[PDB]
Symmetry: D2
Subunit: 268 residues, 4 copies
């Protein structure tokens, strides 16, 4: 008797067992969901990671910049879940911005080709995934994407923050389209999580200044959060995504739920 | 159920159309053990709920009621037991501050009474109940998006703006106990008073204003909005009372069909 | 040839020469405005302060909690500016919250009588002043109130922050009424300024913790502000109020202009 | 004795005499500003439009998608305003989104190449212009961009609304960089200007009304930000929309 019993859910964005999508997939399976997973480029490496999940799940290739992958996606998902079956949930947990657009590089020095690639993968692809999958979604369905509150500028995140601002706007338009199918579309704005890349930057991969900037940003988050914030723990974020995938927020769409310890509601 | 074994206090039941009646019904269906509070007929309404629940008197303007509340709740749930959830579903604004009366004609005594009951009491209830709440607990209040001005709601909208600010401060206090505090901003629901205003209780003008506001709500909402159905709102409150949004506090969840995210 | 040449403007809220209203009045006069001033309770003391302004201006008594003062206000202003003349501008620079609702006192320990008095003076009175003065305002006129960004909770400001959230809502309703007269209504959200009460709290009037909290808040403001923030300087705030009183923002109403060094737009 | 007396201001985005930039340029000149104008592609056609302004102003070519135009811009402006002189103001009044990403075309049918072009011109270029011009801006200077409130989704505007959400974020980062030079960066979010149901709703929501045929209130707001009268506002958005965004109905 789990929160997502009988639900068929697609989960994108697993690359390591530290990926937010790995924790979303794990919690959904613990809650009785039947998953279809999508991975990018390193499929053999992703399969070894997905073997660590509590249950077996088919793994499909999906490069969001690849038009052929998007055009064939619904058919490939239908084959994996069986003809006559449709999805109840879709999780977009995909984000990318080259090092020229986030980190140490000055905001003004990011070339447009890099920013454009980052926006394609991080924001436009939320619309691409909804376009491909809405024709195979059941009424009462739910599409969830991952966000990082971009309402105020911050050091280092730079063009990734710009990509999140675009993503929030894209989510509002996706909700208009999804509504026609009786499907909700929402974003979960998470606090900072120490995923593979974040641990490296903290360790000094981008130098002394970038490491210090991320450290000050994270410490401030746990300080502002009335219930605190654990950057090593994606479980509260995964649970929030599962709450939106469930039947328990049936009147919320085109919206943003903050799984950030309440940090964004406090100044100091 | 979603709330199996949880001990939850629910305030604000007056009729079986009250948002709190639907919150209480859904919470019991989901395995919660309730304590109810009423302001005084309520007993006859609460007898219509799926399960028996003790009913305590609570006038939020009454200092003695607030000072004795924790002790009275402890007696009802048994010594050694604490609350996991608290629902504030209390709102009031005299007709001089809400409806047909011009915005400038509301006397301060009426506005102040409305703010005391609709906003300040969220802090009063948290103060009284936090000492008897378990870690991982949840306090939820009812909101109506006041980010933009609208016809007729007038000083009630002002009271909701104050409530949203109060909720952010309540979260700071609640955090010390490992407790969350959040508001559910609902779309319009046809509760006893709303049905009367639509029927023409406040006249032709006020009835037409509320109707236009509602018609707009369903057209803006990408998934539509059913003003006669409180169940999506009750479910959202239960989602916040559950362990499934454990990192959300001082915040607002919109159970409005997504209307607030669309211009037209 | 000033920004406010020939404009008749009412300015409330002068108590000391550090009052934001004193600086608003000084800048307005430097810019060619003809003022009417209102003072609360200590009129003889206020007259000694207003004698320090560049030009003479009549001083009227106004306690916003006094119904008789509000009912007679328009007639008293008309007598001061001459029959057949009307106001072009109104400045609300009035705020109050008892120490039980702001400072060291726990948020939960503020009695409602104190909170209600603070809301009456800080938020409801913005509507009271508009009701009294709109019948004696010219088209193209402007009503301006003072705000402190209450979108996020902060230590020590407690119930004063709640009062500002109410004020922002009141301003949006005042704009609906003012629009009928061709008059704009807006708030200026200022950064922290060391005025009478704020200087005392910093000095330790509410104890060590309240003083330390305000100090940390002010320091954070200057670091977040891309152009910095000088808490001892009310001139940038006074200039912003004068910009709203001018004919240069003719399509802005029910709104909030931030004179805070841009601090509210930055996380760190 | 105008609002912008002695100020040297660059104004981009004039294409017709109904362009918001034309009205910004006209009001700035009426207020004593000395202008430098930039135009895209149809320079001969733009020059004839700029001749309609009250005063003469040099016209420079600027395609924001052209890296060479951006790299040479500061030097070309300095030559026009004379050596030893710097700008006090910069106006970005540039926007574009292909018809596949706007109007009638379904939101899902806009190819990424079109959306990317729209974002490059409408959002990224605000950063490009600031990068090129900040080294030739005076302290107390002001950069202003044109915005359309994208906080809520609306019919037809689709990917242009997405581009404005990106622009708002870009403006907040530009303010961080501009602050180092003592320069402010802000956007003016305007109501609809005729350069129908959505536009009709605006006038009824606006407490002071909204005239879609009149760009002068928008031009005046931009001039207010270019002046010394909002010296503590940066990374922000000023709404010149009749107050429509503050009202539900
Ligand atoms: N880690 C945090 O602090 C944080 C905070 C808030 C939100 N988020 C967001 O959560 C999501 C997941 O990020 P994460 O932190 O788990 O990092 P991650 O690196 O583990 O996951 C990002 C995923 O994006 C995938 N991806 C990149 N390019 C792709 C393409 N062309 N096609 C398909 N997939 C592609 C990667 O393969 C990877 O699986 C992102 O949207 C991210 O921005 C992260
Ligand atoms: N459309 C809507 O109905 C709507 C929309 C959004 C939010 N809400 C909010 O939901 C909440 C519940 O409203 P409702 O629509 O269910 O109406 P309701 O009339 O059924 O409930 C209001 C409750 O407040 C109680 N109350 C009033 N004064 C009190 C006092 N002094 N002490 C204690 N309790 C007191 C009343 O007894 C009543 O039970 C309110 O906060 C309301 O503003 C309602
Ligand atoms: N100082 C800051 O950091 C700061 C920041 C943002 C906004 N503000 C706001 O600016 C405004 C002016 O405050 P200030 O900082 O200049 O301090 P202040 O003490 O100089 O001004 C407050 C004024 O309100 C008046 N007032 C109080 N009760 C009144 C009543 N019953 N009737 C009429 N007038 C009454 C006082 O007499 C005084 O002149 C207030 O609205 C305040 O909240 C101040
Ligand atoms: N018209 C409205 O309703 C409205 C509302 C709010 C904001 N705005 C904004 O105001 C600005 C001006 O638009 P407008 O309404 O005056 O229309 P417009 O068509 O007159 O101006 C847009 C300008 O962008 C220029 N431009 C396009 N591609 C360019 C490139 N590659 N390099 C340089 N410049 C380029 C065009 O040449 C033109 O001068 C835009 O940012 C627009 O989004 C307009
Ligand atoms: C000029 N006024 C006075 O001398 C005194 C200071 C008194 N102030 C207060 O009671 C309290 N102060 C305040 O009420 C207060 C007012 C404005 C600010 C400025 N601000 C910053 C952010 C937002 N607003 C700050 C505070 C109290 C928290 O301050 C003490 C501890 C310094 C006393 C109000 N006064 C009154 O006389 C008074 C009396 C009755 C009604 C209203 C005012
Ligand atoms: C200088 N302008 C011109 O003469 C033409 C109009 C052309 N406009 C567009 O393609 C499109 N227009 C637009 O891109 C467009 C630009 C600005 C606005 C103003 N605005 C309103 C709300 C918010 N902002 C509105 C629209 C397209 C949606 O419009 C058609 C259907 C009228 C063609 C771009 N132009 C170009 O030549 C052009 C070509 C390549 C790149 C950039 C501009
Ligand atoms: Mg903390
Ligand atoms: Mg609809
Ligand atoms: Mg829990």
């Amino acid at each position: 008797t789990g929160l997502l019993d009988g639900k068929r859910i697609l989960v994108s964005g697993i690359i390591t067992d530290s990926s937010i999508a790995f924790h979303i997939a794990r919690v959904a399976q613990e809650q009785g969901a039947q998953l279809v997973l999508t991975g990018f480029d390193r499929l053999r490496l992703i399969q070894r990671i997905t073997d660590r999940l509590p249950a077996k799940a088919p793994l499909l290739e999906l490069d969001v910049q690849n038009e052929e992958h998007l055009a064939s996606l619904a058919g490939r998902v239908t084959e994996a879940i069986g003809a006559g079956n449709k999805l109840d949930g879709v999780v977009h947990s995909i984000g990318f911005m080259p090092q020229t657009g986030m980190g140490i590089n000055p905001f003004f020095d990011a070339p447009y080709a890099d920013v454009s690639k980052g926006i394609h993968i991080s924001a436009y692809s939320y619309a691409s995934m909804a376009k491909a999958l809405l024709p195979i979604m059941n009424p009462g369905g739910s599409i969830v994407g991952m966000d990082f509150d971009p309402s105020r500028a911050m050091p280092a995140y730079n063009w990734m923050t710009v990509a999140k601002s675009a993503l929030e706007s894209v989510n509002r338009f996706v909700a208009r389209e999804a509504g026609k199918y009786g499907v909700r579309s929402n974003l979960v704005a998470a606090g900072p999580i120490r995923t593979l890349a974040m641990s490296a930057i903290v360790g000094g991969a981008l130098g002394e200044e970038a490491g210090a900037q991320i450290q000050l940003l994270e410490e401030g988050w746990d300080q502002r959060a009335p219930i605190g914030w654990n950057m090593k723990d994606a479980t509260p974020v995964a649970k929030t995504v599962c709450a939106l995938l469930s039947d328990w927020l049936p009147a919320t769409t085109g919206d943003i739920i903050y799984a950030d310890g309440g940090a964004h509601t406090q100044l100091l």
